[PDB]
A = this chain, B = another copy of it.
C-alpha cells in the first residue's frame, strides 16, 4: 500500500449454489486491471481443479463472490492472483490453507507465477503479523536475500515457479 507493507485477507464465500456455470462477483478492489486479474485467476483455478480431482463440479457452478481488500497501489494490485487462486481452491476443496502462511505473486492464465514488487514492505508486514512461512515468486529471491538478516530470520521462504508448487506447500 501507499503507506507501506500490509497484510490483507482475500476471502471467497459461497452464494446461490449442466445448463449454467457459476459466476464470480469481485467486490473489494474495483478497476479494470484487478478485474482482468480476477478473471484470469478464476479461469486458472477452474482449470487446475479440472485436471486435479476432476469429479467435483464446485468451482464450475457455484457463484463464488470473492472479496479483496482495497489497500494496494494500482501497480501492486495484480500481485494477489495466486492468493485468489488459493482462496478459490481452498473454498472448493473445503480444506483451509496451511495456518501461518503468507503469499504474494501474479499468476498467469496457465499458472505460471510472475515477479512482484514491494518485497521488503511485504516481508516486514508478514513479520509484524504472525507469519512463519512466506511464498514468493522465484524471480524475487535476489530481492529477498538483499534484506537485513534480522528481518528474514524468523520466516521460511519458498520461491515458487508454477502454481502447482504453491498447491503443494499450501495444502
Does A169 sit within 8 A of B, measured CB to CB?
no
Does A21 sit within 8 A of B, measured CB to CB?
yes
- Binary contact readout A19-56 vs B (1 if CB under 8 angstroms, 0 otherwise): 00100010110101100100110011011001000000
Residues of A within 8 A of B (CB): 9, 11-17, 21, 25, 27-28, 30, 32-33, 36, 39-40, 43-44, 46-47, 50, 57, 60, 63, 65, 67, 70, 108-110
Report copies per complex.
3
Known contacts A27-B36, A28-B36, A36-B28: A13-B63 contact under CB 8 Å: no
Closest to A70 in B: B33
**Cα-based distance from A9 to B36 in the complex (angstroms):** 16
Known contacts A11-B109, A70-B33: A16-B43 contact under CB 8 Å: yes
Known contacts A36-B27, A70-B33: A14-B65 contact under CB 8 Å: no
CB distance from A14 to the nearest CB of B (A): 6
User: Are the C-beta atoms of A60 and B109 separated by less than 8 Å?
Assistant: no
Known contacts A33-B70, A65-B109, A109-B65: A27-B40 contact under CB 8 Å: yes
**Cα-based distance from A36 to B28 in the complex (angstroms):** 7
Tell which of B12, B27, B33, B47 touches A39, judged by Cβ atoms closer than 8 Å. B27
User: Are the C-beta atoms of A109 and B67 separated by less than 8 Å?
Assistant: yes
CB distance from A2 to the nearest CB of B (A): 16
With a cutoff of 8 Å between Cβ atoms, the chain B residues found around residue A14 in the complex are 47, 109
**Cα-based distance from A128 to B112 in the complex (angstroms):** 21
User: Are the C-beta atoms of A36 and B21 separated by less than 8 Å?
Assistant: no
